[PDB]
Amino acid sequence: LHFVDQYREQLIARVTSVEVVLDKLHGQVLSQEQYERVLAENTRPSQMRKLFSLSQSWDRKCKDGLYQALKETHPHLIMELWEK
């Protein structure tokens, strides 16, 4: 969803449970080689930013999945992001 795209750089610096947020993206939006690639990054935003690098091929299925996982992980953020 263009939501992750629009409020993109804001997620890079606010998504906290990056680990568990990628756990959900594992089986469908991002491959195995990708899963550990973005997981390799040390810091939270370094990891989060690495993830968005892969968006180049995300469709309403992928960009939506990411959104979905985010909403489950931490709702208060995307809820505050919409009010913005």
UniProtKB/Swiss-Prot annotation:
Effect of K71D: Does not affect formation of an inflammasome filament together with PYCARD/ASC
Domain CARD: 1-84
Effect in UniProt of substituting K24D: Abolished formation of an inflammasome filament together with PYCARD/ASC
Signal peptide: none
Annotated phenotype, changing R14E: Impaired ability to induce programmed cell death
Cellular compartments annotated: Inflammasome
Effect after changing E19R: Impaired ability to induce programmed cell death. Abolished formation of an inflammasome filament together with PYCARD/ASC
Domain notes from UniProt: The C-terminal part of NLRP1 oligomerizes to form the core of the NLRP1 inflammasome filament: in the filament, the CARD domains form a central helical filaments that are promoted by oligomerized, but flexibly linked, UPA regions surrounding the filaments. The UPA region reduces the threshold needed for filament formation and signaling. Must recruit the adapter PYCARD/ASC to facilitate CASP1 interaction and polymerization.
Job of this protein: Constitutes the active part of the NLRP1 inflammasome. In absence of pathogens and other damage-associated signals, interacts with the N-terminal part of NLRP1 (NACHT, LRR and PYD domains-containing protein 1, N-terminus), preventing activation of the NLRP1 inflammasome.
Subunit organization: Interacts with the N-terminal part of NLRP1 (NACHT, LRR and PYD domains-containing protein 1, N-terminus) in absence of pathogens and other damage-associated signals. Homomultimer; forms the NLRP1 inflammasome polymeric complex, a filament composed of homopolymers of this form in response to pathogens and other damage-associated signals. The NLRP1 inflammasome polymeric complex associates with PYCARD/ASC. Interacts (via CARD domain) with PYCARD/ASC (via CARD domain); leading to pro-caspase-1 (proCASP1) recruitment.
Protein name (record): NACHT, LRR and PYD domains-containing protein 1, C-terminus
From-to range in the entire protein, with total length: 1379 to 1462 of 1473
